[PDB]
Amino acid sequence: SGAIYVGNYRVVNRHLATHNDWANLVWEDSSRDLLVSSTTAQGCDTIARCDCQTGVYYCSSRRKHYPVSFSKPSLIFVEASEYYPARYQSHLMLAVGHSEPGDCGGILRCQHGVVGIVSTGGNGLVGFADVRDLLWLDE
Ligand SMILES: CSc1ccccc1C(=O)N1CCC[C@H](C(N)=O)C1
Ligand SMILES: [Zn+2]
């Protein structure tokens, strides 16, 4: 679990969004596994606006933050799960690292701020849904 809180927006994995997130929907994209809902109070996370490919992510299944190198956002095949059929997920970045399904939502950060959240894994990898192209999160 986990979210990004920037301005009056809450960014979560779409597959973990609540019925209340859908009522307060701003934007969602199944192909990116992202959902943004509106909030009453202002959030304090800063979104990174950069092309960093190294950062640190939070792994709840280890209670540990790990430094990682990660690929640029791409269209990657993701195996079927209880949340989606087998499909390509877009704006996805992969790294070598530990992840379990409950780790989705953990933040990936660089020196500029929040880059994205954990969204995929399997086979000794961890994948992150990029949010750096969502410029409207800032206004
Ligand atoms: C850290 S997610 C994970 C972890 C271990 C094994 C598999 C996964 C994983 O790739 N999944 C499961 C949850 C939904 C994901 C999605 N965004 O389609 C796909
Ligand atoms: Zn950066």
From Swiss-Prot:
Catalysis: reaction(s): Selective cleavage of Tyr-|-Gly bond in the picornavirus polyprotein
Domain of life per record: Viruses
Catalytic center residues: 15, 33, 104
Chain sites annotated for binding Zn(2+) 1: 50, 52, 110, 112
Record function comment: Cysteine protease that cleaves viral polyprotein and specific host proteins. It is responsible for the autocatalytic cleavage between the P1 and P2 regions, which is the first cleavage occurring in the polyprotein. Also cleaves the host translation initiation factor EIF4G1, in order to shut down the capped cellular mRNA translation. Inhibits the host nucleus-cytoplasm protein and RNA trafficking by cleaving host members of the nuclear pores. Counteracts stress granule formation probably by antagonizing its assembly or promoting its dissassembly.
Subunit organization: Homodimer.
Protein name: Protease 2A
The organism of origin for this protein: Coxsackievirus A16 (strain G-10)
Residues of the full protein shown: 869 to 1007 of 2193
